[PDB]
Amino acid sequence: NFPNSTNLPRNPSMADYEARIFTFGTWIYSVNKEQLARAGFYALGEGDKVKCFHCGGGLTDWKPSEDPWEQHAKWYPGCKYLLEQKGQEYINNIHLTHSLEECL
Numbered sequence: 702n703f704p705n706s707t708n709l710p711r712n713p714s715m716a717d718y719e720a721r722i723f724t725f726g727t728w729i730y731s732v733n734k735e736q737l738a739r740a741g742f743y744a745l746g747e748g749d750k751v752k753c754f755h756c757g758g759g760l761t762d763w764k765p766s767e768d769p770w771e772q773h774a775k776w777y778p779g780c781k782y783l784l785e786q787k788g789q790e791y792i793n794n795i796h797l798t799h800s801l802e803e804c805l
């Protein structure tokens with residue numbers, strides 16, 4: 702499925718931080734569930750797979766160093782929830798950093 706780039710959330714049942722935080726339960730995985738939920742993510746129940754409530758973007762195989770907001774921006778740069786919370790400048794920094802990380 703294509704990512705949602707409108708200002709309307711794909712999963713409004715998951716729009717509230719507390720609804721998202723409940724989806725995780727006991728979380729054994731390397732990224733903090735609070736940090737994931739704050740970045741718009743809720744758990745699927747399939748390992749560490751999370752999905753953004755707004756763009757619907759899905760992310761698996763989280764590494765212990767990784768920032769949910771940065772990953773959100775790397776893979777789902779069209780997310781309007783990301784844009785609202787972070788600003789296009791944060792988003793561009795992240796992309797520049799990512800694109801420069803591979804070049805080096």
Ligand SMILES: CC(C)[C@H](NC(=O)[C@H](C)[NH3+])C(N)=O
Nearest residue numbers: 759760761762763764772776
């Ligand atoms: C690499 C690929 C599985 C990707 N996951 C990540 O980059 C994680 C979150 N660091 C994804 N699209 O799920």
Ligand SMILES: [Zn+2]
Nearest residue numbers: 753755756780
């Ligand atoms: Zn999103």
